Amino acid sequence: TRGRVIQVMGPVVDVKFENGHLPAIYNALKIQHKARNENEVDIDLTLEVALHLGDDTVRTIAMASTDGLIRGMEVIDTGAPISVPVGEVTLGRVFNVLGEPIDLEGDIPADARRDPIHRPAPKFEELATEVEILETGIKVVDLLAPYIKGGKIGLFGGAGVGKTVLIQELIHNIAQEHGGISVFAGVGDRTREGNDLYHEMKDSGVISKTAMVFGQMNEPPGARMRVALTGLTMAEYFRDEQGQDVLLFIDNIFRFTQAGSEVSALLGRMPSAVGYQPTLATEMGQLQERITSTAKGSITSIQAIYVPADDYTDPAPATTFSHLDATTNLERKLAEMGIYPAVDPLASTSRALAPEIVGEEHYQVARKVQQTLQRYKELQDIIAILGMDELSDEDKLVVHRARRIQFFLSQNFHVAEQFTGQPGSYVPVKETVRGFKEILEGKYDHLPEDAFRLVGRIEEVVEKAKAMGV
């Protein structure tokens, strides 16, 4: 009971299994062939099943390029979904979508258990709703949009704003804070960044308690689509057996939505909206709903999103926005201003900025900060085109402190070691919230604004000025 290939149309293939032996949907298939003659080409290729057709035939998608496929090749049926090896063995390694290790360190044995990629989501009975503030050590995120365990978190931006630099600073700070497993998925990631990140994590020695999944842009669209679910199935083993908080990072899900749109067009369905497939909310929900806090522990996730043209009504961002618990917006104007990670104080929102979850002082502090920056945002054009001396002395006070606040949300970073070389550091929550209480009190208003860039404490700001001698 092995199938035979009967059409090829690029990524799509058709296989005519003998009836009585048809695979399920989302099942997996192997081609291994060695060429009989000189003209032929040796092939090792896997396919996934995507819908059934009229008689015996099944319509499938290919995870490696179909070049060299004859008609009438034998297809092996695995009888199961794409199976990913799960265990502690995967700590430190880099994998492809099918679970083979890309790095040359070694090969996972056949004897180990492997878990299916596709599994039903958490039920209504099993789910729970704990609330705890996740101390990330990033001065904007901890002050103005506090992250929470158990939940989907979102980073929205254009291109080249800091999304990957920031995701690296997260992975490093969490590896210092806890020996909690991390899984990183580069879904449709440029093969260049994969080299940068693998060597940065090997050279800072952060990789001992992490795993990595990659699918590059030069992969078929189906292989770009299924890479996020491999990362899910790995993080799910660590929660269910080890029972501890296991972060899942996804490098950009915009490529994932587009890979689904291209697969639907190859399957011959009819577009909608700006050409996205019909089943946009379904597929994305299927992914996003597994990220949860059931009774064993957590799988809190931090994801980044490309917003094509600074208009957020495009289907992929708009469909994503409902699922996310807390979202911070990255704007290129601040990144080019050289204050980092570029996150807008006014446009960032979270569920967790309420006194019952975060804390009484934290609520009063954050709302004073945002009111100060909002009053600065409406005062700059008068400052530009009337004389700056015309601003009232109370508004002049709001100006002076808004300058300091805007700079002191910048922070010196371990990931800057590659780009600029400086050491950086980590800030616990208490020191962020107190330092901003120091900023808002105003006794330190004598120290100059230039000092406040790229620092981790108000004592560091005193030191930098001290070098300047202030």
């Binding site: 390029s65 060299g68 890309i102 260049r192 994969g194 067009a265 050409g275 054009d381």
Partner: protein, 476 residues
């Protein structure tokens, strides 16, 4: 068996019966003598895109199977010639002794094999080399409207590679064949054509030859990179390649998508654009930087081809037509152009001056966008408006006159440190002209330290040099 009969011949496509053992992307040969690239292996008839003239073929003809797969000729012999994507000379001057052949389609280098991009690709174009830097191994889009400056920037790149080693290539897709001749004679006149290959597919050529042109160009580039020499590939318009794919797929009866582009387009371009690399010292230290171009319709954006390519490439340059007709040349918008690799590629002297220049020009871009309409502003803003206006005037440049990096850093340094306040905005393109002559009449040691050290000279002597020139130069 492996001989088959043709049963349609319309439109530049065929269909055939038989050919049981056929493979996707195989070559099959017609009785007329031209050959075709099998591209849909459907249930009972093979689709067969036809290369060359198709008018002679009739139904009932026979196709034999070549057994070979698509291969390009490669050698050192090609350098200095104009050649067809199938590999034939089209320039006169006779045949070329290509020692061996490489496949058109093959796997790219893995994630481990590459290294970080750390050495520059100096172009001689002040606004790029300062504000949107390129490093060897980088892939960067130039996208703009028609008649804005895509090919002039490409040619300035190929012309500047005389001074630093680069086995550059240039691929022309769909072009008017007399424009290709004007380009080739421009490369010959500037003394630059003997270290480069030019590949031509003209507008007359049948559809598959437009489609396969960048795949064969990169197949020529990567051999030199495997030897270990730096390489540069330019694709003169990727959008015309995408259109050739659309027309080829629609004639093959494939389910369409947005616009009508077939759903495979993003994969097809990623198969092209991810072969570019910077191989490790274990693999030889080579490079293959690539510069694709896309022509956008009326300042269109968020369209299917531009968003695909803008997602793939590690940077993008956006050229503006309304900038061009306002006197900025080559017109480059600093606001919408980004380089993810930037900062690392530049020489250390450039890193210091170009980093601050980005800050200055971003700050004035916003202040001018609103406050220029009102006549009088705050003093500090009138100063920042003056510095921005001088910045854009000092970044204007001539045509086919690359400026060496040594004299770029010295003009940008003169700009950022504010030596140009005394001089009027109109006179600046003459301040540059009279200064670079002075800098070859005096200051050769400064340039020599920068040439090999990659390092900014001592600030006492640099200021002494600029102050002496400001004694010589005469203000209008």
């Amino acid at each position: 068996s492996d001989v088959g009969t043709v049963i349609q011949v319309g439109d530049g496509i065929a269909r055939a019966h038989g050919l049981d053992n056929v493979m996707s992307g195989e070559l099959v040969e017609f009785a007329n003598g031209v050959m075709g690239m099998a591209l849909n292996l459907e249930e009972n008839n093979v689709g067969i895109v036809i290369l060359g003239p198709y008018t002679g073929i009739k139904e009932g003809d026979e196709v034999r199977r070549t057994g070979r797969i698509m291969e390009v000729p490669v050698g050192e012999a090609l350098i200095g010639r104009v050649v067809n994507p199938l590999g034939q000379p089209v320039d006169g001057l006779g045949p070329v002794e290509t020692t061996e052949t490489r496949p058109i389609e093959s796997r790219a280098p893995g994630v481990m094999d590459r290294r970080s991009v750390h050495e520059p690709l100096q172009t001689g174009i002040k606004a790029i080399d300062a504000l949107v830097p390129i490093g060897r191994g980088q892939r960067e889009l130039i996208i703009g409207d028609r008649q804005t400056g895509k090919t002039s920037v490409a040619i300035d790149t190929i012309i500047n590679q005389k001074d630093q080693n680069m086995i550059s290539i240039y691929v022309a897709i769909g072009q008017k064949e007399s424009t290709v001749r004007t380009v080739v004679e421009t490369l010959r006149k500037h003394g630059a054509l003997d270290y480069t290959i030019v590949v031509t597919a003209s507008a007359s050529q049948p559809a598959p030859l437009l489609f396969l042109a960048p795949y064969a160009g990169v197949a020529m580039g990567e051999y030199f990179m495997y030897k270990g020499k730096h390489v540069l590939v330019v694709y003169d318009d990727l959008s015309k390649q995408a259109a050739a794919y659309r027309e080829l797929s629609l004639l093959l009866r494939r389910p369409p998508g947005r616009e009508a582009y077939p759903g495979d387009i993003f994969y097809l371009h990623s198969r092209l654009l991810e072969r570019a690399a910077k191989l490790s010292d274990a693999k030889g230290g080579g490079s293959l930087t690539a510069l694709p171009f896309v022509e956008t319709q009326a300042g269109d954006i968020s369209a299917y081809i531009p968003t695909n390519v803008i997602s793939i490439t590690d940077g993008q340059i956006f050229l503006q037509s309304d900038l061009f007709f306002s006197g900025v040349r080559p017109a480059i918008n600093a606001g919408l152009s980004v380089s993810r690799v930037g900062g690392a590629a530049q020489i250390k002297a450039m890193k210091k001056v170009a980093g601050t220049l980005r800050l200055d020009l971003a700050a004035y871009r916003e202040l001018e966008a609103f406050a220029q309409f009102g006549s009088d502003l705050d003093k500090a803003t009138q100063a920042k408006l003056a510095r921005g206006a001088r910045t854009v005037e000092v970044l204007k440049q001539d045509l086919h006159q690359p400026i060496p990096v040594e004299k770029q850093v010295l003009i940008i340094y003169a700009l950022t440190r504010g030596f140009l306040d005394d001089i009027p905005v109109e006179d600046v393109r003459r301040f540059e002209k009279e200064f670079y002559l002075f800098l070859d009449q005096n200051g050769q040691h400064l340039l020599e330290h920068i040439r090999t050290t990659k390092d900014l000279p001592n600030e006492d002597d640099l200021n002494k040099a600029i102050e002496a020139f400001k004694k010589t130069f005469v203000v209008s």
